[PDB]
Subunit: 296 residues, 6 copies
């Protein structure tokens, strides 16, 4: 009697979708839906279920963008101010979490038994991977290539494989496209690493202190030199430093090394595609063009 | 091949649950599982489904602690350092969100469909709650009291009700328990509020830290709205004061406004409501529940 | 006997006039004396009294420049380092206050009974207006247009109307030029607001957290969006953010809106001028050119 | 029209006087109006003109507090938070400068011409005082003692003399009281100085805050200039130390320099001067004034 | 000419030695010159050469304090402020490195060639010691115990051995004393370690400041390496905590690991080694030395 | 028995030479060896001893670079990140000190009795000079020209005269080249001062708060103005301020003044050279070219 359980208004949804709505107003090179469509050419998910799966994966991406941006101490997103630079860590991060739950509600519309178990094991692997990623960031422990690639097969594999596992579970075609999306996600990540140092903020995951792929090669190649790892430890907003670091990693030939690794990996993903295609699936031109876009 | 995918190891789990484990090696006030016992007097969920409901709420709660401690900018949890002052807010936050994943995975062990609707609707409401709380914090504009109470119904009711609704789900009795457990949650948070400012809490979660953090809490809302034309307290919240003198002044002011009396009397009326409701339930084919009122009485000052 | 009351040396005046002297060495688009002269064409204050009134209004301007610069967390003044970036908040602010008192001493040379009451009611209105201006800055309460325009009719009206009220009180002509200087000051302020976001620091009153005229229109137009008001709350020294904010306020058409308001206001000030002129005063070409300079 | 000018409202005054009101809900040592009573024994200004002189000095003083607390970077006024830790230095400063305007408006109620010359010349001197103080602070160069005393004559004498000169103005007796009241002001500040470092002040305005702030105060000037070749103390001021250990060390050092004895003895000679002067006045058609020496004696350690 | 080179003045020396002098007006535990006496029982260096050896070690040590206080980021030396909180890390560092120059100039007074080889090899080792210490600090990677002990042999053995080796040099007895004095240095630092965390030190050099500074110290190395899979303590070091609650938690944890017992027992075995060695020396044409074991016993808990 | 005194590995020398090795990988206008060679044309130190003296002076330079960079709050060294921006104040500074000791070990190879006394008196004078330099930095006491020139004859004279005194002590020629290297070092320093404000970080010893030669002239020329000394006190990373300061020092004609002082000083060093040469030494073309390089 003393408390009248008030209803959820739309102004309060607006307040809660704000860091998210904001992120969704910023144009970006959406490659996630592109990956869904090019794999749909093989799966043929109905359009209602495929609509639902697209909605959820997009929500999850923007929500983890908010979160990870907070956790990375990132400054810029899609060229414009990073969400929490406007709404603050708290509000923006709770909004990340909120959209996670709203996406769970969404998944439930697929009204498929195995949907929730897949969504779960994906979130488990997401945070497994970015957990170790941080465990290394915070410890100044340079991992191995193999350690880095296992954590990537967790962290990026998470939403890539989520999109595809949901599709496989909503289709008629029982072909395991996930050992391919795993390779594609690993490649996309290595690519994202490389471009973060050689492209056109300038070297922003040096400021993050990340142990990215060419950073690991550079560090382990000559261990006797501890400038690069100390610059990782300094988390530098200065560009004199970041530029020195680019210098040192060039002097070690780690971008050469990374481009070679990307080359051999695109090779493995080509043979892995041509296998499926030569087991009776339509020639995928779309995924060829998409994989091609991963290069610089 | 080149990349050979390998398996998750136990050392790695230990790293992932490092903030959460820590936070759980810390003595707590047990008031989740106690309320579960209080209601299981009536619901009588089997011991196994109950063991799962209890791990799910224990998890979701410890995770909520890990994450709120960062969002609120808290200095001490359970009198000990917040986890993120040991692991850093990044690892503490990923460890929270990981454990949330772990609970969703665990709550499937019930193999109960309606349970996932319950779990979702809850997390949804929990975040609508913390969202309106944050929104009135960062905007430095005082809610009303009705607004505060709805926000609390969401935030703190969202896990009282999760536990009791999972129980109802695994039970078969057709009696709604949820208005009562919501009422208990609102009381728990009003009490929690008062106690943050008026119990030597001041050793567990710091000297009025609801002030350093800037929450518009129930007594703070009273004091602020009682003399609108006096801005010292709301301005004080703005300044998010780590300093003890400022918090002392705000406490003194808040006494001047007869706000702690107001709080006590509200919790009085609400406990009357909680009793009248236990009694109305009990009077309908249910057993005299004692622990359910032992706990309500252990919400008190 | 133990204390010899020492005299005021010139080296100590030099120490005290320092933040002020500094500000007076920096070239600026002096529009204040221009406003005095163009109104003098109607008042004809003798040259001794007009000299005195010019001195005092100039002192008051530079002193409040010092003060307000401190209170705004401003960084640059007339392109060069803001006074307290050199002498510090304390010294510079006491020097503001010191010049306030020296100007009071000055006013006393007008040896007119009503001079002090006018100077007072002007300072009262000054701080009345900038008080509410801050009360809003600190509270994140977006005011109305009407609230903003009343506070401007205080805060800028203060020294504008001080110049003119002193002149009216030193002249023979008993015509109430103040309901016109009020409109002129309001216009000058709205103009100053607009130029602070669309001109050539870049958007520095976003960094100040101000609720300026186009900022208020932008915020109230869509309340459902709280990015701009949150960016006001973030007080951003970053330019990515300030530029986003310019973007959002363009997308709302608030510079269009402000230019329209300025247009209608210049209209009212033209009719308000033409009235006085068509009541037997010489055609003021100067104030026409001065009002014209307020536009961009 | 478009813009319609409206009127100032009472809620708005409440906002403008929010820092000042606060600062005035704080218990003070009354030593302004007491000195006014001490002299009104002799001046016998009517009760109404005195009521105005007293509001003017009460205002100018509370405003001076609001503004000095920001300029000095002080942490506590009257044992309670500085106003600007509640309203922010911007509002606290505008509220100060507003009240200064309010006093100038009020001092016209005397309808006395010479009073405005008095009020001006005062504010002028007050700022020449705080100006030389700030100038020796920021330059980290020690004044002499004579230099310090002239600065104090300006800064702290500028409102003792404002009150007593407004009184003389509303009176008609042709006796200068001002050298005595200046002398009393210098004593008040030397005392104030010592007391900042040597009285459990340490609870009102913090543990030697004249150190955290870096004022070259009378005992600090003695200690610094006494052993020029030892830089620890002046360097300590430079470091503007919030830390208690550093202030403790500087206090210990300052004892080693027999600087607090020096202070006490100077205040002794000056009280002798103040008595001899009260006596010389009294001996010239004036009444034995007791409160005037009760207050001088209440300046003491 | 234009430039006319002039001479160094005494006021200027006073400026150069301002941090060092300060740091020397601070009460110390004397344990350098005491160990010198302990050995001069055996070496019997003349009083004059000894006076020089003692000034050289007194200097090199006080300088090492000035400079380590900056490198470690320490808050208090000998319970009083670090010098660089009075003069600034720049002057404190130049004053340190100046005094090092002063010792090199002074150690020539011995007019002993082998002494410069000794002095060099020492400073060399001292910096190899502080270097590996810093290297394991900034990399946040725990040494082993053997690694820690070698680092200590360098850092803290480098001035025990400097004093005793200068003595051997000015003596003529052909007995190596250096393994024993190295052993004593390792004990001095293990003790120093324990004592930093377990003696009310907490008043001299702050509440576990070896924690705020992040040194991997002997008990910290034990606790960290004892449960590798538990990261709280090493992560705590990372956070370099000025806060008392965090240091309290790390201390409690470190007890849970039976690390202070481990320390005590190691210092037990090492004191056995130091005795057995004094006894083996003594048993070879040397005198029963008592002060040499009085000091070893005064290393104790 | 419980402790096995382990040996010094090369990986640990690598750890300790790191801030130093780093500094030695950065190309710079090495003028120090140039000064040794051009004076060797007069001294003829054998090549073994001259090798040793070159090694030690180079080590001492890089080590004090590390140190002074820390003490100056410097940001950039030879265009690239300053050592402690990578390894931190502690490690880098201990590495400075370490190389000081390693250089002492080196000097010992000259196996000359007077080498150590010279090395000492040089370090004594080094820190004597930079001591007073700081004593003034920290006190906001502007020295005199004479005071500044005595401290420079300490601080820079230190390593210049160290190089030359070691050479004189290793040669056959007993001619006091030190009253000349003193003048050359003073000139090099004044030059370094001037170029730090008028060249191509921008005015970085204003940020350091230094009382450099033209800064002293500017400050003492008009004492009545305390903007420049207050900007020295503000230690400004902003460029608006540093640029204002350049403005003020131009308006005082202190770069004119410094160039004139440098002119008269190069005159004295020419006559001081021509004296030695006209006492029977080979015409030094090298030192003429070297002295010429000090000008801009």
């Amino acid at each position: 009697s003393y408390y009248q359980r008030s209803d959820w208004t739309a102004d309060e949804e607006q307040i809660l979708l704000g860091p998210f709505d904001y992120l969704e107003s910023l144009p970006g090179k959406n490659m996630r839906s592109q990956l869904i469509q090019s794999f749909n050419t093989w799966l043929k998910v109905p359009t209602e279920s495929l609509d639902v799966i697209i909605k959820v994966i997009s929500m999850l991406h923007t929500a983890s963008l908010l979160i990870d941006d907070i956790q990375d101490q990132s400054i810029l997103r899609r060229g414009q101010p990073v969400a929490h630079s406007i709404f603050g860590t708290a509000q923006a991060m709770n909004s990340g979490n909120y959209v996670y739950a709203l996406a769970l509600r969404e998944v439930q519309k697929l009204q498929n038994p195995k949907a929730i178990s897949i969504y779960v094991d994906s979130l488990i692997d997401l945070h497994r991977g970015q957990g170790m990623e941080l465990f290394w960031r915070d410890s100044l422990m340079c991992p191995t290539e193999e350690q880095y690639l296992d954590m990537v097969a967790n962290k990026t594999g998470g939403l890539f494989c989520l999109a595809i596992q949901l599709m496989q579970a909503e289709a008629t075609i029982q072909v395991d496209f996930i050992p391919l999306v795993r390779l594609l996600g690993i490649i996309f990540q290595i690519c994202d690493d490389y471009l973060n140092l050689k492209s056109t903020g300038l070297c922003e995951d040096l400021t993050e202190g990340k142990f990215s792929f060419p950073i690991i090669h550079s560090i382990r190649s000559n261990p006797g030199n501890r400038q690069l790892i100390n610059i990782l430890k300094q988390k530098p907003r200065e560009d004199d430093i970041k530029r020195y670091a680019l210098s040192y990693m060039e002097s070690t030939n780690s971008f050469e090394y990374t481009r070679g690794v990307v080359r051999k990996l695109k090779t493995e993903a080509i043979d892995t595609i041509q296998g499926l295609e030569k087991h009776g699936l339509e020639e995928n031109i779309g995924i060829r063009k998409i994989l091609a876009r991963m290069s610089l």
